[PDB]
Amino acid sequence: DKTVLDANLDPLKGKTIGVIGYGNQGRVQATIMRENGLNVIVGNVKDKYYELAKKEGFEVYEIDEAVRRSDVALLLIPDEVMKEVYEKKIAPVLQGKKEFVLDFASGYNVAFGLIRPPKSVDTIMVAPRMVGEGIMDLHKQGKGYPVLLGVKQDASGKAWDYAKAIAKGIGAIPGGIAVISSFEEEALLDLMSEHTWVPILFGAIKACYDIAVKEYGVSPEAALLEFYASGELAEIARLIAEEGIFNQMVHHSTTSQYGTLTRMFKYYDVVRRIVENEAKYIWDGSFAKEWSLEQQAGYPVFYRLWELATQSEMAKAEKELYKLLGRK
Amino acid sequence: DKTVLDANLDPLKGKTIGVIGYGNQGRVQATIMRENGLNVIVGNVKDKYYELAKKEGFEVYEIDEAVRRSDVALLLIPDEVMKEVYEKKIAPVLQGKKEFVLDFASGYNVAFGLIRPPKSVDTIMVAPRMVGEGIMDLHKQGKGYPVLLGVKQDASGKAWDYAKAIAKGIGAIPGGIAVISSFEEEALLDLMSEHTWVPILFGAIKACYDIAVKEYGVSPEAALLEFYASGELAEIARLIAEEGIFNQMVHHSTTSQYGTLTRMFKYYDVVRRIVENEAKYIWDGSFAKEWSLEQQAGYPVFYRLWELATQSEMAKAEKELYKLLGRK
Amino acid sequence: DKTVLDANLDPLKGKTIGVIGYGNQGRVQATIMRENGLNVIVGNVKDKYYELAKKEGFEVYEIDEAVRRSDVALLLIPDEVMKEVYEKKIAPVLQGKKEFVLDFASGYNVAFGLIRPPKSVDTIMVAPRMVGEGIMDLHKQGKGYPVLLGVKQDASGKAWDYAKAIAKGIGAIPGGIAVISSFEEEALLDLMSEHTWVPILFGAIKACYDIAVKEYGVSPEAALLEFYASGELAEIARLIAEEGIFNQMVHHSTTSQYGTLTRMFKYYDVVRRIVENEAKYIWDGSFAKEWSLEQQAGYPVFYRLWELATQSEMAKAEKELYKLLGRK
Amino acid sequence: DKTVLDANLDPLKGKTIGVIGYGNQGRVQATIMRENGLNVIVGNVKDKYYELAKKEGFEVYEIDEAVRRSDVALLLIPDEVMKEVYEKKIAPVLQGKKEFVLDFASGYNVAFGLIRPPKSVDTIMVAPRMVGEGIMDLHKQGKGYPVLLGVKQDASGKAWDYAKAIAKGIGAIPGGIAVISSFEEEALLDLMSEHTWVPILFGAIKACYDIAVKEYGVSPEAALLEFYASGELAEIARLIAEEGIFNQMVHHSTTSQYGTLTRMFKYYDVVRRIVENEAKYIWDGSFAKEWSLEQQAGYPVFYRLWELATQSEMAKAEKELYKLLGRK
Ligand SMILES: [Mg+2]
Ligand SMILES: [Mg+2]
Ligand SMILES: [Mg+2]
Ligand SMILES: [Mg+2]
């Protein structure tokens, strides 16, 4: 449809490639890049990660050095450490370079205007789709892992070609798919995930535990063993990624199927309203504001909630148990 | 009533006059001041505006220089660039000068405590009442344009005299009126305007367009030509400023009058509640907090909303059309 | 799209042209017509307007005479004086003429069945888009002013050609656009305008004034000078018609932009509901009934509301002030 | 306060006095006028009332004749027969006379714009305050009966003098009071009375009867004898007009006082809301529209409701009873 199965590595050999960051994503993607027959330069703060950088025989310049000698760059560092790096070591160096390309791994800091490069350069995006560490093995196998991509600013016109060449140069394709889209969409999706069906799930589990062991005289042990302390969910998720979310259910018992489907169609509207609210709250921009402020203030709420969770009942029972199984 | 038609230029000749800013308001008011037989000194950042400053043969000192050699000063720069200037180049220099006068063009940054000068000096206000560029021509004609004024701090007692002398020295009077009031009132009014009947109007127009071209099969063209792409509203606003808001309507058709009046008296209560809410939200101070934070965060929401607007349907249709008419 | 930029003056020379009315619209459009090299006949009541008619050297027949000698006619008189003229001096004369064309300036009296000509004739529409007097100058310049047009009844088939020829013969094009549409749409639009965002605006202004000068101790003077007694709105409306509703805002201060956009997106749903209600109320036909009855009864409500408005506080304060400025 | 106890009969002798109408109010007030040493002319339709007119030795001209020979006139005919008389026999004759005075007995037909005389004349009001027949006897005694008065249009300036002279010429003063007010107020008051506490009272009585004789097994006879078939209410109303609404209650039993006061203060808010609604509905003008339409339609609802009332149970029982007492 709006997909590409494979493409050319046409321009990105004859130029240098800047990789800013050597952590979860930077180190890995750079490993793959070097594997793809490319010229490694890696600008990074001379901290622990620097060891890490040069513990794989790379050219670890400092950030300014890298971009100066680079014709293209990647910002694979996280979203919150940025806006300081950019202003300090980058924003200045931009004005000299003019045929420079800037790519990201997430449209967050750019889809909300937190970063506004000059017109001189081209602005694109490319996104992996899993835990970071999870890509290592899937490439070790050598099977395609998919990505997204989008463009914000095309002064040259080679933008799309650049995007596809990079997608290939990281090996996401062949084997996987590459979808054309925008930044807005990417960020929207990541945040809808992190905001809608994860926390709901967790809260529902928590409530089930509370109810059982507060109003029906159950011991924590059975509650935990049922809800999550068993590896059921893992097999479920796996079967989903292989056969299909629904068809998967064929491998369960009927009773389960009936109750599940009924209750699902019975509650759709509620979660629908919820998701509408949250997606709107995002599309506007409120959440980015909220989070930037929480960073500027000292991460208080973060702390309090981590504490409440780790100091609730379920967590202590889980500690006892996981200890009993030897699980760390 | 509480008005003055004309007053004396008594003290403000024998002193120097500091004008901080040379933009929309500073450049203009300083033009008029020099026209009034006065001594021009203009402290400004040595940026583009500096050219602008000295492209009219003024004494462009730097800010500190100006205030040092000034006995009175004006802050005609915007509201958001301030609180940095004040702390850096001003707050220090205050402690030396003691008979110094400080005047503003808006009570925003002072009515909410964002600025608290020392007791040594006198604190006043004086406010024009239009687009800035709009005052240029109305003076080119030489007809009075009105203003406000208020006082916050009077250590001498000459405050009011100073205010009136300045009002005259900028030419707002003769010909216009000068109202005594406070800062609170001025800011409250500006913000009620910017928050209540402008955005409501825009949203209503937008909704009318959406409804028509989504549920009655109209083409954007007619919708736009009716609602705003015609210069009707301009003639309306003009007739208002000349005859009176209501009496104006005499020049319309009856049908229009009937429907308008009916619907107006039919919906008063709703907008009343709304305006109450917003005015309270302001009187408290919440909005200033909100906005200062949005500045500290990176203007995200600003950006997203500019995008949504400029990337909605109505805007694209309007672009097509205005192109068709040759309008920029 | 569904637009025409210019067209032919093909049939409308070789026939006579009936203009019923010589007021805001009739006199003007007839001026332009005579300017376009055409044969002027003007049926009008022998009242003041008759002087007016023949104070421009026209052939002022009486209505019946005009239509008798006309092959085509225009009803540029208002909407409420009609339904008496039609029945008395027109409906009879129709039955003789058979290749007769009938055009209007508004679909009100025909979109609601208040007028139902015989099948013998062709029924069309053509609509200017401003105050009437406002077209005079825009033609004096000679730049296209746009219109609408639609058809109700085509016995010949030349209808569209007739419509376009007339549009050209009044000079709306070249320079402007001409949109094909129906009557329903035209009337719907005019009334949505006159019912939704005008009265809302007025009521909001009124409420702001009331609130300020009743609960925060402001004097009427400043309230008025802020809200409307300044020509701000005029410059706003003008910039809209030139650059675009939104892009316009660039010439304002940020703060204004932020507050405006926020509050706009915050209240959209309310005005949406309102506009839905009113548009439905119209689409049905209720409003036409209401208004025709109010005419049959003696225009009471009209009177009472004119009084309330002209005898409210804001109006008296405005009178004092506008007197103070010399404004009539 | 805003009252006058007695005044001069200064201008109104040396002019003729037009009395349009010879019914409840016209015949009576004209009787008093002739008694006051004045020149009787009475324009009236040559119907039964004409006999009536000239059965008291008056100069019964026809309407046009009267006004032609009159310098001042009174419209003491009802409110619904008017707007036909005015247009037919009056509106024309106005344009000749220029120092003419026009007075009314109710601001209804003028406070709602149903009548708009030319600027040439003076427009005033004067209002009796009881049943019409009730004034006959109170003058037969010769004790002052009060009135209102107001002005709408004063081209001369003698208006107020004219009003007071007339008030005296009808004998309302001396002995009574004359209050200055407007038309709006007069009409508003009459209608609030006719709309708020009369119908409420009637409906409450009706409901009490229904409840008793439907849910507690009472016979109509006792219900009627208690509620209204006894002359209690008459003595109550009389004592009110003499001592005072409240002080009156002293002549009752305590129990009654206690229950009455309690329940009164217990229900104030409800009737308050009601009265607000109705007074607004009037102040606007809606009711006049409603009523004029009901007249234009054929008085249907009037008829149906008269029937329902006269054909309800309470009415039949009352007929039986009043027959039993011989009361007509
Ligand atoms: Mg993520
Ligand atoms: Mg402002
Ligand atoms: Mg119209
Ligand atoms: Mg009455």
Tab-separated table of C-alpha atoms in Angstrom, chain B:
chain	number	residue	atom	x	y	z
B	1	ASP	CA	-16.467	62.658	34.883
B	2	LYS	CA	-13.147	61.087	35.871
B	3	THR	CA	-11.598	62.455	32.701
B	4	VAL	CA	-9.177	65.198	31.719
B	5	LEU	CA	-9.330	66.880	28.329
B	6	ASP	CA	-5.940	68.615	28.343
B	7	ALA	CA	-3.138	69.259	30.810
B	8	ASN	CA	0.275	70.817	31.302
B	9	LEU	CA	3.682	69.814	29.959
B	10	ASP	CA	5.098	71.280	33.140
B	11	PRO	CA	7.977	69.138	34.522
B	12	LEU	CA	8.999	67.106	31.494
B	13	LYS	CA	11.300	69.725	29.988
B	14	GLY	CA	14.469	70.115	31.972
B	15	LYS	CA	14.925	66.351	32.294
B	16	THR	CA	16.001	63.546	30.011
B	17	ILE	CA	13.571	60.911	28.781
B	18	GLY	CA	14.518	57.247	28.552
B	19	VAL	CA	12.795	55.138	25.920
B	20	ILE	CA	13.621	51.453	26.243
B	21	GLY	CA	12.571	49.888	22.963
B	22	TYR	CA	12.265	51.063	19.373
B	23	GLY	CA	9.692	48.674	17.916
B	24	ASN	CA	5.968	48.948	17.281
B	25	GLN	CA	5.438	51.348	20.194
B	26	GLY	CA	8.859	52.670	21.135
B	27	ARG	CA	9.900	53.957	17.731
B	28	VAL	CA	6.522	55.593	17.159
B	29	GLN	CA	6.030	57.249	20.540
B	30	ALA	CA	9.628	58.463	20.401
B	31	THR	CA	8.964	59.953	16.973
B	32	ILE	CA	6.054	61.883	18.452
B	33	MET	CA	8.115	62.883	21.490
B	34	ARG	CA	10.930	64.312	19.387
B	35	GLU	CA	8.188	66.073	17.443
B	36	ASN	CA	6.953	67.604	20.712
B	37	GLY	CA	10.225	69.428	21.340
B	38	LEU	CA	12.022	66.988	23.619
B	39	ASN	CA	15.427	65.395	24.195
B	40	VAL	CA	15.672	61.938	22.631
B	41	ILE	CA	17.675	59.195	24.293
B	42	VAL	CA	16.909	55.600	23.375
B	43	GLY	CA	18.427	52.587	25.098
B	44	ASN	CA	18.106	49.475	22.986
B	45	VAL	CA	19.847	46.202	22.306
B	46	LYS	CA	22.341	46.721	19.490
B	47	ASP	CA	20.397	44.486	17.112
B	48	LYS	CA	18.472	45.235	13.927
B	49	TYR	CA	16.346	47.702	15.898
B	50	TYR	CA	19.505	49.678	16.632
B	51	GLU	CA	19.862	50.420	12.934
B	52	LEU	CA	16.200	51.305	13.169
B	53	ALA	CA	16.853	53.493	16.193
B	54	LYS	CA	19.623	55.445	14.553
B	55	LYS	CA	17.964	55.408	11.161
B	56	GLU	CA	15.957	58.309	12.623
B	57	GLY	CA	18.853	60.343	13.998
B	58	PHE	CA	18.467	59.523	17.686
B	59	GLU	CA	20.928	59.231	20.563
B	60	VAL	CA	21.070	55.443	20.855
B	61	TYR	CA	22.849	54.769	24.094
B	62	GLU	CA	22.926	51.316	25.553
B	63	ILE	CA	20.276	50.551	28.143
B	64	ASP	CA	22.456	51.188	31.184
B	65	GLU	CA	23.864	54.355	29.622
B	66	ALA	CA	20.371	55.648	28.889
B	67	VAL	CA	18.941	55.145	32.364
B	68	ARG	CA	22.142	56.460	33.917
B	69	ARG	CA	21.765	59.696	31.967
B	70	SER	CA	17.966	59.624	32.113
B	71	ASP	CA	15.814	61.005	34.891
B	72	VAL	CA	12.738	59.146	33.594
B	73	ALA	CA	12.250	56.056	31.476
B	74	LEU	CA	9.730	54.089	29.437
B	75	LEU	CA	9.519	50.330	28.955
B	76	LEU	CA	7.796	49.986	25.590
B	77	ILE	CA	9.295	46.563	24.864
B	78	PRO	CA	6.990	43.526	25.032
B	79	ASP	CA	5.865	41.663	28.125
B	80	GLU	CA	7.741	38.379	27.683
B	81	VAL	CA	11.216	39.656	26.847
B	82	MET	CA	11.036	41.544	30.136
B	83	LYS	CA	11.993	40.185	33.583
B	84	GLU	CA	15.420	39.478	32.094
B	85	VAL	CA	16.258	42.999	31.029
B	86	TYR	CA	14.932	44.332	34.327
B	87	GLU	CA	17.037	42.014	36.466
B	88	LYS	CA	20.191	42.370	34.389
B	89	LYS	CA	20.567	45.964	33.242
B	90	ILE	CA	18.060	47.852	35.383
B	91	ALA	CA	17.496	46.507	38.898
B	92	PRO	CA	21.139	47.309	39.716
B	93	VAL	CA	21.147	50.864	38.384
B	94	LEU	CA	18.019	51.740	40.366
B	95	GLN	CA	19.725	51.899	43.732
B	96	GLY	CA	21.776	54.930	42.725
B	97	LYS	CA	18.991	57.055	41.267
B	98	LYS	CA	16.385	58.250	43.756
B	99	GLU	CA	14.181	60.855	42.051
B	100	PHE	CA	13.680	58.442	39.173
B	101	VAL	CA	10.341	57.843	37.485
B	102	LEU	CA	9.298	54.566	35.890
B	103	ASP	CA	6.365	54.307	33.490
B	104	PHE	CA	4.885	51.375	31.603
B	105	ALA	CA	2.531	50.637	28.741
B	106	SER	CA	0.838	47.684	30.450
B	107	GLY	CA	0.238	46.619	34.031
B	108	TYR	CA	0.752	42.940	33.289
B	109	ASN	CA	4.280	42.455	34.583
B	110	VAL	CA	3.649	44.657	37.627
B	111	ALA	CA	0.044	43.941	38.522
B	112	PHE	CA	1.053	40.325	39.134
B	113	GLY	CA	4.150	41.116	41.169
B	114	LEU	CA	6.516	39.930	38.448
B	115	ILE	CA	8.310	43.236	39.031
B	116	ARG	CA	8.704	45.070	42.329
B	117	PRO	CA	10.856	48.175	42.105
B	118	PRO	CA	12.279	49.788	45.227
B	119	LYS	CA	10.396	52.400	47.202
B	120	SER	CA	12.870	55.059	46.080
B	121	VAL	CA	11.075	55.623	42.775
B	122	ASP	CA	7.629	56.467	41.437
B	123	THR	CA	5.572	53.851	39.608
B	124	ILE	CA	2.857	54.817	37.118
B	125	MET	CA	1.238	53.658	33.888
B	126	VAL	CA	0.062	55.034	30.552
B	127	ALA	CA	-1.604	53.006	27.803
B	128	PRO	CA	-2.353	53.549	24.111
B	129	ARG	CA	-5.432	51.826	22.714
B	130	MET	CA	-4.799	50.314	19.272
B	131	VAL	CA	-2.497	48.277	17.027
B	132	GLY	CA	0.559	50.504	17.387
B	133	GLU	CA	0.867	51.077	13.657
B	134	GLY	CA	-2.689	52.391	13.883
B	135	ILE	CA	-1.568	55.343	15.999
B	136	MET	CA	0.955	56.495	13.406
B	137	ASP	CA	-1.706	57.555	10.912
B	138	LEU	CA	-4.144	58.950	13.475
B	139	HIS	CA	-1.389	61.302	14.599
B	140	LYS	CA	-0.320	62.010	11.018
B	141	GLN	CA	-3.826	63.455	10.874
B	142	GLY	CA	-3.291	65.108	14.258
B	143	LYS	CA	-6.514	64.081	15.997
B	144	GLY	CA	-6.529	63.004	19.617
B	145	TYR	CA	-6.189	59.314	20.375
B	146	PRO	CA	-7.160	58.317	23.918
B	147	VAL	CA	-5.242	56.502	26.625
B	148	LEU	CA	-5.459	55.275	30.185
B	149	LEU	CA	-3.257	55.958	33.154
B	150	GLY	CA	-2.779	54.859	36.723
B	151	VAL	CA	-0.380	55.021	39.617
B	152	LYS	CA	1.105	52.342	41.837
B	153	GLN	CA	3.681	54.184	43.913
B	154	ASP	CA	3.966	57.896	44.706
B	155	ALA	CA	6.910	58.833	46.897
B	156	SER	CA	7.093	62.408	45.602
B	157	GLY	CA	3.481	63.377	44.919
B	158	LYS	CA	4.151	64.730	41.413
B	159	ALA	CA	3.085	61.344	40.027
B	160	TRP	CA	-0.246	62.427	38.570
B	161	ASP	CA	1.312	65.583	37.162
B	162	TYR	CA	4.015	63.432	35.591
B	163	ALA	CA	1.419	61.110	34.094
B	164	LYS	CA	-0.587	63.934	32.559
B	165	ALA	CA	2.493	65.735	31.278
B	166	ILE	CA	3.588	62.547	29.541
B	167	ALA	CA	0.127	61.921	28.123
B	168	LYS	CA	0.311	65.356	26.558
B	169	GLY	CA	3.907	64.865	25.457
B	170	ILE	CA	2.824	61.893	23.356
B	171	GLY	CA	-0.100	63.806	21.869
B	172	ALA	CA	-2.852	61.407	22.925
B	173	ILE	CA	-4.411	64.635	24.186
B	174	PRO	CA	-5.592	67.194	23.128
B	175	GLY	CA	-8.391	65.673	21.063
B	176	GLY	CA	-8.791	62.521	23.130
B	177	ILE	CA	-9.598	61.615	26.712
B	178	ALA	CA	-7.407	60.353	29.540
B	179	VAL	CA	-8.977	58.153	32.197
B	180	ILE	CA	-7.656	57.640	35.697
B	181	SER	CA	-7.587	54.006	36.756
B	182	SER	CA	-5.299	51.325	38.144
B	183	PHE	CA	-3.085	48.644	36.663
B	184	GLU	CA	-5.389	45.779	37.627
B	185	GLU	CA	-8.172	47.293	35.571
B	186	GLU	CA	-6.021	47.836	32.494
B	187	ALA	CA	-4.625	44.321	32.413
B	188	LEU	CA	-8.007	42.835	33.245
B	189	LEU	CA	-9.554	44.613	30.284
B	190	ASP	CA	-6.888	43.718	27.749
B	191	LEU	CA	-7.095	40.076	28.738
B	192	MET	CA	-10.883	39.904	28.839
B	193	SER	CA	-10.841	41.165	25.277
B	194	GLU	CA	-8.192	38.705	24.156
B	195	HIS	CA	-9.983	35.839	25.911
B	196	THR	CA	-13.745	36.238	25.539
B	197	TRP	CA	-15.246	37.645	22.354
B	198	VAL	CA	-12.399	37.192	19.869
B	199	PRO	CA	-11.895	33.440	20.283
B	200	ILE	CA	-15.615	32.869	20.624
B	201	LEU	CA	-16.169	34.661	17.337
B	202	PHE	CA	-13.471	32.669	15.576
B	203	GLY	CA	-14.737	29.362	16.896
B	204	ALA	CA	-18.288	30.161	15.881
B	205	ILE	CA	-17.223	31.007	12.344
B	206	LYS	CA	-15.227	27.798	12.172
B	207	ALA	CA	-18.168	25.764	13.405
B	208	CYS	CA	-20.544	27.345	10.914
B	209	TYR	CA	-18.196	26.422	8.087
B	210	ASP	CA	-17.761	22.874	9.339
B	211	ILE	CA	-21.484	22.329	9.757
B	212	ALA	CA	-22.393	23.718	6.360
B	213	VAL	CA	-19.792	21.860	4.333
B	214	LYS	CA	-20.297	18.647	6.288
B	215	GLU	CA	-24.072	18.332	6.614
B	216	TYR	CA	-25.725	20.432	3.901
B	217	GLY	CA	-23.476	19.856	0.895
B	218	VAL	CA	-22.074	23.332	0.407
B	219	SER	CA	-18.798	24.144	-1.232
B	220	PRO	CA	-16.146	25.929	0.834
B	221	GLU	CA	-16.220	28.813	-1.610
B	222	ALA	CA	-19.640	30.171	-0.699
B	223	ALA	CA	-19.130	29.557	3.008
B	224	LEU	CA	-15.963	31.627	2.980
B	225	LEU	CA	-17.369	34.371	0.785
B	226	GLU	CA	-20.253	34.762	3.201
B	227	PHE	CA	-18.631	34.486	6.603
B	228	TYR	CA	-15.414	36.496	6.342
B	229	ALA	CA	-13.854	36.438	2.863
B	230	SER	CA	-16.032	39.486	2.222
B	231	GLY	CA	-15.164	42.870	3.682
B	232	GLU	CA	-18.550	43.187	5.370
B	233	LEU	CA	-17.145	42.947	8.881
B	234	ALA	CA	-14.848	45.879	8.147
B	235	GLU	CA	-17.692	48.219	7.232
B	236	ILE	CA	-19.595	47.001	10.281
B	237	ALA	CA	-16.732	47.705	12.673
B	238	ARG	CA	-16.192	51.113	11.104
B	239	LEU	CA	-19.829	52.154	11.403
B	240	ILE	CA	-19.661	51.057	15.033
B	241	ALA	CA	-16.760	53.361	15.850
B	242	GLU	CA	-18.651	56.279	14.263
B	243	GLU	CA	-22.382	56.084	15.039
B	244	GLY	CA	-22.697	53.535	17.829
B	245	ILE	CA	-22.813	49.763	18.085
B	246	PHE	CA	-26.597	49.550	17.903
B	247	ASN	CA	-27.714	52.640	15.985
B	248	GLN	CA	-25.351	51.306	13.338
B	249	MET	CA	-27.765	48.462	12.669
B	250	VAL	CA	-30.233	50.960	11.207
B	251	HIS	CA	-28.265	50.684	7.974
B	252	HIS	CA	-29.059	46.971	7.721
B	253	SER	CA	-32.235	45.109	6.806
B	254	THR	CA	-34.999	44.593	9.336
B	255	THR	CA	-34.876	40.801	9.179
B	256	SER	CA	-31.241	40.958	10.211
B	257	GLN	CA	-32.092	43.259	13.101
B	258	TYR	CA	-34.884	41.040	14.374
B	259	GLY	CA	-32.956	37.800	14.263
B	260	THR	CA	-29.851	39.385	15.719
B	261	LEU	CA	-31.563	41.010	18.686
B	262	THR	CA	-33.648	37.954	19.486
B	263	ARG	CA	-30.740	35.545	19.449
B	264	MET	CA	-28.622	38.024	21.382
B	265	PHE	CA	-31.022	38.308	24.285
B	266	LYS	CA	-31.549	34.557	24.029
B	267	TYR	CA	-27.937	33.578	24.754
B	268	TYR	CA	-26.731	36.318	27.112
B	269	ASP	CA	-26.603	34.091	30.185
B	270	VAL	CA	-24.252	31.516	28.680
B	271	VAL	CA	-21.546	33.935	27.620
B	272	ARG	CA	-22.123	35.661	30.941
B	273	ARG	CA	-21.142	32.533	32.848
B	274	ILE	CA	-18.162	32.069	30.561
B	275	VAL	CA	-16.902	35.608	31.031
B	276	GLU	CA	-17.330	35.319	34.780
B	277	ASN	CA	-15.171	32.206	34.793
B	278	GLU	CA	-12.413	33.786	32.743
B	279	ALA	CA	-12.363	37.114	34.560
B	280	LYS	CA	-12.071	35.267	37.852
B	281	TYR	CA	-9.310	33.051	36.484
B	282	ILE	CA	-7.472	36.269	35.676
B	283	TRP	CA	-8.211	38.362	38.766
B	284	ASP	CA	-6.631	35.523	40.713
B	285	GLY	CA	-3.415	35.289	38.707
B	286	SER	CA	-3.577	31.779	37.312
B	287	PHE	CA	-3.203	32.830	33.692
B	288	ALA	CA	0.051	34.696	34.245
B	289	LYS	CA	1.465	31.585	35.874
B	290	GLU	CA	0.274	29.422	33.001
B	291	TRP	CA	1.863	31.686	30.428
B	292	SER	CA	5.173	32.170	32.211
B	293	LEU	CA	5.477	28.410	32.487
B	294	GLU	CA	4.649	27.918	28.828
B	295	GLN	CA	7.496	30.308	28.106
B	296	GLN	CA	9.847	28.424	30.406
B	297	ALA	CA	8.955	25.144	28.704
B	298	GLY	CA	9.490	25.931	25.020
B	299	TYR	CA	6.219	27.238	23.632
B	300	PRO	CA	4.937	23.770	22.673
B	301	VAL	CA	1.197	24.317	22.779
B	302	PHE	CA	1.598	27.565	20.881
B	303	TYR	CA	3.264	25.569	18.131
B	304	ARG	CA	0.778	22.716	17.986
B	305	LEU	CA	-2.183	25.059	17.797
B	306	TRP	CA	-0.642	27.278	15.151
B	307	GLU	CA	-0.210	24.081	13.178
B	308	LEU	CA	-3.733	22.757	13.677
B	309	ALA	CA	-5.192	26.076	12.604
B	310	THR	CA	-2.928	26.550	9.601
B	311	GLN	CA	-3.456	22.886	8.660
B	312	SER	CA	-7.230	22.739	8.949
B	313	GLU	CA	-9.556	22.665	5.966
B	314	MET	CA	-10.849	26.220	6.140
B	315	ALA	CA	-7.293	27.522	5.983
B	316	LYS	CA	-6.398	25.561	2.857
B	317	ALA	CA	-9.572	26.609	1.093
B	318	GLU	CA	-8.819	30.184	2.110
B	319	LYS	CA	-5.336	29.855	0.663
B	320	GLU	CA	-6.668	28.628	-2.666
B	321	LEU	CA	-9.169	31.462	-2.776
B	322	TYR	CA	-7.002	34.371	-1.622
B	323	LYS	CA	-4.552	33.142	-4.235
B	324	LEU	CA	-7.335	33.337	-6.785
B	325	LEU	CA	-7.918	36.990	-5.871
B	326	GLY	CA	-4.198	37.749	-5.794
B	327	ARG	CA	-4.405	38.591	-2.097
B	328	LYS	CA	-1.185	37.766	-0.257
